[PDB]
Design a protein around this ligand. Sequence first.
Ligand SMILES: *[C@@H]1O[C@H](CO)[C@@H](O)[C@H](O)[C@H]1NC(C)=O
Ligand SMILES: *[C@@H]1O[C@H](CO)[C@@H](O)[C@H](O)[C@H]1NC(C)=O
Ligand SMILES: [Cl-]
Ligand SMILES: [Cl-]
Ligand SMILES: [Cl-]
Ligand SMILES: [Cl-]
Ligand SMILES: [Cl-]
Ligand SMILES: [Cl-]
Ligand code: NA
Ligand code: NA
Lengths: 482, 482
Amino acid sequence: QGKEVVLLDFAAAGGELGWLTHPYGKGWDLMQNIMPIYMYSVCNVMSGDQDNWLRTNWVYRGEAERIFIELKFTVRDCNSFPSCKETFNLYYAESDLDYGTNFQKRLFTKIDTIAPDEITVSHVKLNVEERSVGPLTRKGFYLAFQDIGACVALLSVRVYYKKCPELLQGLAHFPETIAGSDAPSLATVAGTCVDHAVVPPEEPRMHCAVDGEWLVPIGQCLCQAGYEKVEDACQACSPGFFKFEASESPCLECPEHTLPSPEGATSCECEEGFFRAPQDPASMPCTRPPSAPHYLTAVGMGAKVELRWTPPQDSGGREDIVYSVTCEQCWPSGECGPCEASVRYSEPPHGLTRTSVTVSDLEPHMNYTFTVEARNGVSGLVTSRSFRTASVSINQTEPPKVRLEGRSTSLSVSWSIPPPQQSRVWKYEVTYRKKSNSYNVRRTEGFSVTLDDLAPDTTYLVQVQALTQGAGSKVHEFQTLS
Amino acid sequence: QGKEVVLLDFAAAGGELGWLTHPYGKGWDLMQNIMPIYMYSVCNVMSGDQDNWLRTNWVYRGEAERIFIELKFTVRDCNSFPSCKETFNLYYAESDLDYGTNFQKRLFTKIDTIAPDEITVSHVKLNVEERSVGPLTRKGFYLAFQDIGACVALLSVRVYYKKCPELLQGLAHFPETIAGSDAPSLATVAGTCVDHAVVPPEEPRMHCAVDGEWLVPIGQCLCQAGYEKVEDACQACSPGFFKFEASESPCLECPEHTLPSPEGATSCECEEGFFRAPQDPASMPCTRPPSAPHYLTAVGMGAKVELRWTPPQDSGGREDIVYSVTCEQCWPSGECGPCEASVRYSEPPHGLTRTSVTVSDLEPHMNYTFTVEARNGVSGLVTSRSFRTASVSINQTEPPKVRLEGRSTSLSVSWSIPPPQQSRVWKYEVTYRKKSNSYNVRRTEGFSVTLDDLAPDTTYLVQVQALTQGAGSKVHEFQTLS
Ligand SMILES: *[C@@H]1O[C@H](CO)[C@@H](O)[C@H](O)[C@H]1NC(C)=O
Ligand SMILES: *[C@@H]1O[C@H](CO)[C@@H](O)[C@H](O)[C@H]1NC(C)=O
Ligand SMILES: [Cl-]
Ligand SMILES: [Cl-]
Ligand SMILES: [Cl-]
Ligand SMILES: [Cl-]
Ligand SMILES: [Cl-]
Ligand SMILES: [Cl-]
Ligand code: NA
Ligand code: NA
């Protein structure tokens, strides 16, 4: 149930309300019972022809469309005393002027015959009856009651109308609106967003019914950045909190490494020495550049150097860690300088996410120092650097990488060396022994030989040296067919 | 108003319906008036103590919650014949079994006292009265009528209940639902998207009221790609039409240069020789590469060449037109070849949106042919080329560009030439005459001289030649102070 606005309340007046009766003498009469109770009684069941009227004061209508008329009464049984009726009539008249004592029944429209559910034979049996009328349009109206020979006491008369009350809901405001006249009335009432609230992407609406109930909520408003919902309004975020968007969510407390916020903050400021990247959301804690790769190994396996490292002990709270590798040369001469352009990497030496690289094409005996640096998203915002160094010497230059391209029974062999080294080699020298003092060497400028005139199902020791005006491969075991 | 389902209709039965009366003899009785009209009459206003009951058949309730009971009747005036009442009583009883002739008034709950609005003194004055009761829960119910000494004819009795009908709205389906019992009942009923419809981003809902009206639509479904809304459903796009998205829009007809579509098309296919770029929306007509720049001029103003052109006559229906310039050299020797890397352009010679460029650093006497090509977004999809050619010869190499850096009374002069030409110059030669056979020449390797010992407020003719082991500027008029 919603708002009732009362227009008339006979009982609530304690007798001081005085209504016109026609005729002046006979018919309805005000009665007091004493604890005073007042009432309007008529009981002329004997007289053969009655037409007794009771007319209320002029009632100002205001904004009311449908009025509700609530009556409380007793009726005595026509068979309970030895031309009688047990009902009365209820009328109304609209009008813009209050006519005072000038009352004319012909201007009154009949609402209904009022009958009792219970009848007395004197147990105080109080009937209740409600009717309604609408739409009304004039400035005011009158009610009336007609008795044609009933024995009635009329104890109460309430006229009220219904409203949908002023409403705060869904962070919007809805004005008090008058319940409409027709029963299938749902009036759509637009809402107003309370201060610091907004409709983001459905606009707030409510539907006012004839009983004054608000029925079906459509849409809502949301508290904007720096504000949240507290009860029915928007409030500034507490000190220590933030909110960056218009959402239906509370203020989030300040993330890690951040400076205590003032009221209505859309984001907390960064702590000294901590930062944010231009892609980081306000919800992300302040971060910093990482420490150095925790461990780094530089191992000279063969002619190439392998660098293997480990992520930093401290990431500075980030997950976008990359590595970059740089190099210095030093001749143990004493002189030093940056790495030559002839050094290659197994992977472009910057923007590394892998934790290892292979370095090739290195001058022998030279002391190479490799520095591997760790950087995350906030690194460009500090001057400082986090790195580890490791030094390697290499002895042999790149040997030929040799494989079998086929076999019979004979052994068909191929090899390769990186194209920068290919200028250095004068000739390749192939050696083959049987698996103690009798080997066979051949020479070529090319990259493949077939070893001929060999024993079936036999293990041979094959080596390929790169010769210069050098560096030789590992011994391979190659077996002939059967 | 919505769906009424009738449960009982006395008048609509033409007498063949037969109701229990208590007592069997006295009281209510079926009467026929002849054009047959049937009715139930009691008129024992004389007898001192009446309690006459009329009980309907057992009525099966089905799914009904609130029933509506509509009566039509006459009542005669108790004063119209010389223990009388002018009302009757309406009761009901719920029950799961039909008890037949076994009728027990004590099981009947009173709905209301029924009174007439109009009373007869015989003009056929037919009162109408509606009441309702609910919620009901048992399998069926009975109505009854009680007369205590009224003279009533009862001509009609309709019990019905209300439903919200099965509904197609907003491209969703809503099941037939029973109107609820309570007046402030709005039952929310979810809808089902009809075939080929979808909820894109609010889900369809309707609200069923107690009178069987559907009240407030929330949400909708939309016809998906290849489909549109026709009446209350989704239909395949006509031949000749398309629709690419789920929207509330009709099928669009096929754009220009396109192949007639089959039913339910999401896009029309391209006409032979026409294309679409991988960024073009389905709504965009098929396009093609443009024609050549309509006009091109190649003019050798000085040492530089100016190319000015004009957009193509035919754009192939596009607005993303770019130009690119290329160059061939030919010595009038006869031999030809691509342009040297020493030729510069006033603007990177590809991706041009401008319709002109300046070409500088050109070898004298050489026949340069410039080709300017037009390309739009669909050009990469054809092999063909649209271009215009224009040829230019240049005579002089770049002269010094000379300006006054200051003056007195003297003239302080500076010049420049593009750094590629700066190697060629042995010395610069400055000549100055007074504005007929007496000039003064000086020489420098640098780019500025101050002319000294000059007359006040005087016009001088200054030229600067670039000398080689050449090319000289225009004559400038420089005036001293006063
Ligand atoms: C280079 O190698 C030596 C050992 O040969 C090592 O101790 C030294 O620290 C390395 N680099 C530099 C720049 O000190
Ligand atoms: C080059 O210039 C001549 C005139 O000197 C012109 O007629 C000729 O068509 C030009 N280019 C070519 C490649 O034919
Ligand atoms: Cl009094
Ligand atoms: Cl009304
Ligand atoms: Cl040799
Ligand atoms: Cl009959
Ligand atoms: Cl009820
Ligand atoms: Cl000289
Ligand atoms: Na009535
Ligand atoms: Na009643």
